[model samples]
Target: IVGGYTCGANTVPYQVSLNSGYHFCGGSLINSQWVVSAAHCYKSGIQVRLGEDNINVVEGNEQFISASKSIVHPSYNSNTLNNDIMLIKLKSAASLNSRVASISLPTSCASAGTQCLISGWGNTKSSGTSYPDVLKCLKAPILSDSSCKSAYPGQITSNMFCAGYLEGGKDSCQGDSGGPVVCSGKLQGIVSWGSGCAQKNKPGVYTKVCNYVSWIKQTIASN
Candidate 1:
């Protein structure tokens, strides 16, 4: 996250690193066997790392598991990035502990001005190269749909929302896609897209996770 601080050890236990060779995207561990991330991060083979704090260090508390199945939203649009959420079923159930646990999905839509916690191991600069080894977090308020529409103009959809300062300085950046945006202790959004990292009036756009709660449960139950 740009203009954010390093996350304390195990403070965000539900966060996970979606890896192919390296940490390509961040994800939320919604259950012992299911992880929620962005559809754009999907790949043939993905390794999910739980209880991870520093990407460069072992820390001795991480759990590595392969994704056994990945299901993207049926109507997901790649062009406009609508419905950008995806769920990954782990090969085996993760052992829950102090450093690894699941987060609950949001039951209701987060209202405007809700101060949510956005986190990732993405670039810290808007236009530079820096992927922090440790997880980073930023506190951003959920902008109203009208304001989000004004910010992007025809880009923000009902399945998407914007969060960050209008003046710019902080946001989820590249490599942060599929990361958690938690509000009121619930997973509310998934880092989806934006014009640029932390640019003026271009707050980080996120896939509204609240709208997909039923779909997630259904998929997990049958699959």
Candidate 2:
């Protein structure tokens, strides 16, 4: 799997699906009672689905938990999409199992050229509206902050990072936002926003999770 259309069956235990009634966004299981995703995914009737591979219907192995509270970054910008990270507190703690687990957060940021895996139910086409029925995955390289700045110019901020090919192919599209970008089995980034799906010279932009380690801890602690 490489691009938006390229699909893989790799199972990620820390992966969680955030549902906003009609639409779904991807997220990560930080702990038994907390989840992390993109701030843009904030909405009413949000539900967290764990241990789910196929989201078409209710599965025996899946765990559905309603969000009791959503902590959107106070400095999040909707227009620029900067600081596009958020935390979700589950109403009930999730059950730990083989298919359900939490990922460790990195103490620092990932370096450029780091290979990471992204999995989600985001749109498969750049100009399409339909989402995948089953969870899909792809691998892409992280772009240096300097290199990413060249592509996005004035758009990318310190809270964000870039990943994917500059030639245009692999990327995360709409509905993929709030998904995990894991490198070396550690939570590294969260899919934020991009110009479009797999556009030339426009790689997938993600919320730099490592940069907000303090914020994440503060929000979780204060809430």
Candidate 3:
């Protein structure tokens, strides 16, 4: 079982293939040559697909790019979920098609209380089955810096941000990790963790995208 979950299958955009079916938790197209995702999704010989729907069926005429290398964040700690990021450099530049557009990375301006969007093919209900095929999208308001720290206490580092319902009942789950948390057309965060998906008193934690701009750029360029 992938990640200790049974239905661990989904797709990122542009790099579709049948070997592993192109399931990615979080990803962004930086340019025609680079796609960023979570390091947790990295595996040897894994393929990266971009701008595709029907991951199970493979019907879309989306761009398919193979990964030349998968680079995980150097300081990443899987147990604590810190620095949980990565980049996939395409074997070649992808075609500039409307269906496969690049997303802008946030360099600044995202702060506490900003509203963000997250999309995934994870479980809709907290304790139910995972949706391996259909992509689901949702919005979350950023938590105040104070509120975020208060909720997660010492666990809330400056490198991270918190979003979602404070009273709980709505959050990113297992299959949703590494997904984008967009704000004002900019990618602000990456889905990281929460206290058991959608339970009360636990907000969804995310990697602060703005804080990692240098790291992301360096990783992509080096790889």
Candidate 4:
């Protein structure tokens, strides 16, 4: 993440790394057996590493569990990047503790100007190999839908919302997708896409988590 600082261990316990040998995406543990992430991060066999801070080192509290099922939004549009959220059921329920816990899902939409915390193990630079070994976090405020539309033209959809400065210099980059964008201690957004890391007039766009609250609960209830 650009313009961010290292996240201390266990500070964001709901955070998890989507790994397949290496950390590729970030996910949030929503319940004992469920995780919420971006649909674009889905793969056949993904290992969820819970209670992780540093990806390159073995942190004792970490729990590596494989996914038992992955459900991408049925109407997800890859080209437009709409409905880019996904749910993963862990092979076994994650043991909760101080260093491993689930975050609550948001019940209402996050309003514009809400300050949110975004954490990830993504690239720090827009055009270089600077993926951090440790997790990083940035404070970005939610931008108005109109402002987001002006920045991305016709690409902004209701399923998507943006947070970060239009002036840039701070954003969730590559490898950060599927991570959490938290507001008021609730999971409100999922890192989905953006136009270059920390670029001018281009804020990090995210999957609006509020819109999927019912769907998430229904899916979990039935499955």
Candidate 4 displacement at residue 152 in angstroms? 0.2
- Candidate 2, residues 120-208, lDDT tens digits: the string is 88887766676777778888889999889999889988888899998987788887889999999889999998888888988889999
Q: State how far residue 216 of model 3 sits from its true place (Å).
A: 2.0
Clashes of 4: 0
| Candidate 1 Cα misplacement greater than 4 A, ranges | none
Give each model's whole-structure lDDT.
0.94, 0.85, 0.68, 0.94
3 versus 4: better lDDT goes to: 4
lDDT tens digits, residue span 129-194, model 3: 655565566677898888888888778777678888877666777767666777897877777777
Q: What TM-score, computed on C-alpha atoms, does each candidate reach? A: 0.99, 0.94, 0.84, 0.99
lDDT of 2: 0.85
Worst 10 residues of 1 by lDDT: 125-134
